[model samples]
Target: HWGYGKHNGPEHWHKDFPIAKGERQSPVDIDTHTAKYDPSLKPLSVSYDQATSLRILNNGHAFNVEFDDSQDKAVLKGGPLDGTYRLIQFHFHWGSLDGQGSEHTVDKKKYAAELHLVHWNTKYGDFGKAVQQPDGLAVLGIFLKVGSAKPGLQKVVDVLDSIKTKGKSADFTNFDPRGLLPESLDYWTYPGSLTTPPLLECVTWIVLKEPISVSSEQVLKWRKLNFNGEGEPEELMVDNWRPAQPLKNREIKASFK
Candidate 1:
């Protein structure tokens, strides 16, 4: 019953997962002008070895690019973090067909889609145990815009066909996640939680100001996946994004002027 579907949407998430209504919930609207510029924040350091990529699977919610994090082969550090964070997986949120789909908005403007590179601070241990703490996770969000096909993204796009079904998975390796990032690393920092259940408050969000482009054809193929597993009712896996939460008094921090 819990999903992106109308019957079980974000509006009703708090019913069972009460934390969805938490004050530090994610996917907030980022007001660039009002955001405070911080010079103290260090530049993001990324070390990704494509060989560390294990596989890619359609987890019903979205297609996840999984990595072999047994030894921290791919790690994230230096951006609003105290220690090294290992990259566990990467997924996406998108609209059906077109228009606004991203969870976080920019100055009231929404993007076509959003990508989440989910990471966990290794100091606290695995993602499961770490999430119970306040600063256990760090998610890198990259907004997707409609534009010409980007060669760097084509590697991931080409695998969409094999994972069209909800439970389908393929042995996808040697895929460099660095290829997914936009040219500019300038971004905003904020305290937040997972956009989905159980909506744990463990994420320190690093949202890139510059957006990456993807061809409509690639998006169309992604929308073809289903929300249910195997033989369940065919529910197109589109519009899988949470709505922007109230900013309240949270200050959006800018890493660049």
Candidate 2:
């Protein structure tokens, strides 16, 4: 019932998940002026060996590409983290229009979409256990703007047709996610919670300042996906992103000057 619909959207999530109103609730509008440049923060390190990519699926909420996190082949380190984190999966959030789909905005400017690379700290055993700890997860938030087509993103888009309905999955291997990233690794770091249900306040958000490009045509393909399962009435899966929560005195630290 917790969905991005009028009756069960972000506004109503707090009823089922009371932590949704917690201090570190995620997807805050990043006010650039208030961001502090933290020289102590190290450069973010990301390495994704194509072999680690497993499959892509439509899990009723959004399409996600799962990774084989059995080892450290795909990992994220440095930049506000004390230990190495393993890449588990990556998913997206978008809207019906190109102007406003992303969960986190920049200086009040909304983007066409947002990408979240979900990782779990290796020091904390696994994702299930880590999610309950404050330092368990590290999610890289990359914004998507409407513009040129990204080759890496094209691979994911191509599979959307196969997973058009909820619970559908298709084999998607050997795809390097690095191709989806922008040239710069400059980012803003903060302590936040999961933007979805059970709103666990355990994520270390590393939101990239630079955004990647996605063609309007490509975005339209994503809109073709259905929120309903097979045999259910079709409901286009758009506007899956949550609105930005208040900063509530939390500090956002910038990696660059």
Candidate 3:
């Protein structure tokens, strides 16, 4: 049910999807300066590999990329962090137009967009079973801001021409998602819930403080993507992000050592 305009907006998602009540949400306002500190929080790793298969779905709300796990690799290895997770999918969150875009907020301030890197634990025997466990999911959150230019994101935008038409998908070959990662792997980790509906509480969130930048024009292109079918006139996909939620008695820790 990802769509644009009136009832389709993220703010109104709760009404259409009743499961929103129990969803463990993310990007809530965390005091970067004053929140409790943990110097041991470092990324387990950041690695990449060839995706065996890649599919872009026009899920009525936004374009989502699903890939095969057979050809993927886990970049980070042993540490206090678990290493049995594998990359499963990657997606974006943006505004209805270029003017506003962002998923999580800090102290009420929002960024331009958010990228989610989803992975599941291998210990559960398979991804399907892992997702149901409390420690089965790990998500990396990267923030994007509007700026002069961003070379890292060009790979993604380059494919826009292929999926520009609604419900259109193409087989992207030799895709390496690592190109989208920021220079700094330093992140803040916390126990949290999924940012989407059915809000599974089984996610360990690692949000990067360093944000990547993208040109204003790129943001405009994302806004132009449609959520509905060809039979229905397309609506702007802008403002796909949700407002910051209450921390609900949670504490966030950083890996700044």
Candidate 4:
């Protein structure tokens, strides 16, 4: 399986998934000076019904909070998205240390971690089918920095102990994902792919310019998570982020000046 380990990390992904090096790959470094400010970009609309949350699980790659997408109860619209995108799941990418986690960087600056709210375009039937469409996915990226503990994030961190090993999951509901967002919706957007394999080039990446805060103690609990299941070799789950990919000729448009 593809992982962040030295042998099978980002550099070695292209061998199995050739599209890993495709023209429009994900998690590109955002240089504010170069990003075009587009006045026409609409403000992002995010409405998440907390009751739609189903479970939180450790998939070995990242711990994801899954949602029930049977209805459009939790959806993301506007911004760079052309249609309503139903929330599927949300996860994080972090480093073993605080300074080298986020997949996307601002002026080449790394954050402590990055959060991804993955949504699928409803027009394409479902997530399985949407994965093949060019305009299928809309991922909202929020940066996480080390600072005061975020109360909103603590709701999630409080549950981490319940899912300490890979494949472990617990019933997690009534969790409002919107609580995790920054107050400002200002964002930079571009065409990109899934940072993980299959590495499908189907996402419309909307990365927020503002970062949310998480305490050092909170992140310490995150590092306690294991990539391996109980009784395995005990590999710690850290530095689970893909390196910044080539931007190619893609234009990164910002919604804020």
Candidate 5:
């Protein structure tokens, strides 16, 4: 399997999954001045059930909050989507104090971390089927700037201690992902991929312009997580982000002026 380390990182994924070198890769550099404002873009709308949040898992790559998406109990609508998309999972990618992580960049500016809320178009049946199509997935990205501790992030931060190592999982419920978003829905839209291997060009990237605040202390907890499990050499789980790819003539559309 591909990893963040040099031996099996992004540079090598293309060898096994040739799509890594494909034109429609994710995490592009968003040049603010050049992004076009689309007045027709609809306002973002979402509905999440309190019990839809299933469990939290540490899958070696990163920690994920999985949701029960069987019945569209939680969904992402409006914004850049043509139809309803189900919220399947959400995860984080971060870096160090040197600021070398965050898959997507804004005008070449990088944040300490990024949160991805993944939703798959239900028209194609499920995530696996949808991931093979050109516009079958939508990911809402939230950038995290170091500052005061975010109230909405506290529950997530608190659970990190329990899943400090890889392959760990716990019952996680009674949470809503919408609370973690910033005050503004203004975002930059582009067509991209998973940012990881298989690197399918199936996503519509909607990156929020306003960054959320998270204290340095909170970020430290994020770094404390181990990408390796028991009997494996302890490796901190930071810098899990992929490098930004070229725009390759794709359009950057903004939902607001």
Candidate 6:
């Protein structure tokens, strides 16, 4: 499964990966050239206590945190985003090595990796049903690069020892995801789909221009994750990111003021 090859990549994923067609994909190159201001869009309010129930779930692809109503009650009422969207999950897409794994590109430059915070509208009652609706989902994209250590992320990574095995999870209590957000709330909004298989176009993307930093070693530790069985040799799970997608006539707006 590791050597799926180039043809099997995003360019031809639709043929081999049936779910690729329905999932909302990303790693799009953010072109600020055509971007304009959107005064109508407002910023979403994130609550601290509501963000603490978040738990990190280690699936084969990457380590993801499942967010539920209990964990996202702080901003469920509505913020800069439209509708009452509750955080559903958070995950990362990274490269095989350490230099290039991010999904979103800036001026053709891809970072080490990207982090996604997924949310769904409460109108649908739950995340599974909301996935089918166009306006039922919201996703926040944050780029990550190799740089000085980010003490904020240490709280999450420090617990990696507890969930080292696939399908394993540890109670990440007293943790607030809001602390993971970049200093600037300025973002680029657009209509898009999940970047993975079953690519659904129901997500409203909010990509932050600012990036968060992590030490190179920390990134390597992430690559050390293994989806294979424990008895099997620990194969490096690097390059877990999809390439950027085409614009398809969709316009992306930013709020930088």
TM-score for each model: 0.96, 0.98, 0.87, 0.98, 0.96, 0.87
Q: Which 10-residue window of candidate 2 scores lowest in summed lDDT?
A: 45-54
Per-residue lDDT of candidate 5, residues 1-257 (tens digit): 78898798878888899988788888899899999999988888767654278899999989999998888777888988899899999999999673756789988998899999999999988999999999899999999988888987888889989998989998888777877889898888889999987799999888999999888888899899998996799989988999888889699999877
Each model's C-alpha lDDT?
0.88, 0.93, 0.69, 0.93, 0.87, 0.73
lDDT of 5: 0.87
* Tens-digit lDDT track of model 4 for 1-257: 78889898989999999998799999899999999999999999988754388999999999999999998788899997888999999999999999989999999999999999999999998999999989999999999999999888888899999999999999998888878999999999999999999999999999999999999998888988998888899889999999898899899999998
Ranking 5 against 6 by TM-score, winner:
5
- Residue-level lDDT tens digits of model 6 in 1-257: 32224544466667755656443455467888777777877765554355645587777667887655653473433334666778767888888766689888887788998988888887888888988988878888898989888777787777777677677787776666776778887788888887776677788888888999888877877877775445666655567677777776677788765
**Candidate 2 lDDT by residue in tens digits, 85-125:** 99999999999999889999999899999999999999988
Instruction: Write candidate 3's Cα lDDT for 72-163 as tens digits.
Output: 46433322257666777778888654445677766556788888888777777676787677787888888888886777667667677677
RMSD of each: 1.2, 0.8, 2.6, 0.9, 1.3, 2.8
CA deviation > 4 Å runs, candidate 4: 49-51
Candidate 6, which segments miss by more than 4 Å at Cα? Answer: 1-12, 16-25, 70-80
Q: Say what the RMSD of model 6 is.
A: 2.8
Winner on lDDT (2 vs 3): 2
- 255: Cα error in model 2, Å: 0.3
Q: Rank order by lDDT, top first? A: 2, 4, 1, 5, 6, 3
Per-residue error (Å), model 3, residue 102 = 1.3
**Candidate 2 stretches greater than 4 Å from native:** none
Candidate 5 TM-score, C-alpha based: 0.96
Error of 2 at 141 (Å): 0.6
Residue 102, candidate 5: how far off, in angstroms? 1.3
lDDT of 1 by residue, 64-132 (tens): 999888886788889788898899999989998568889999998989999999989999889898898
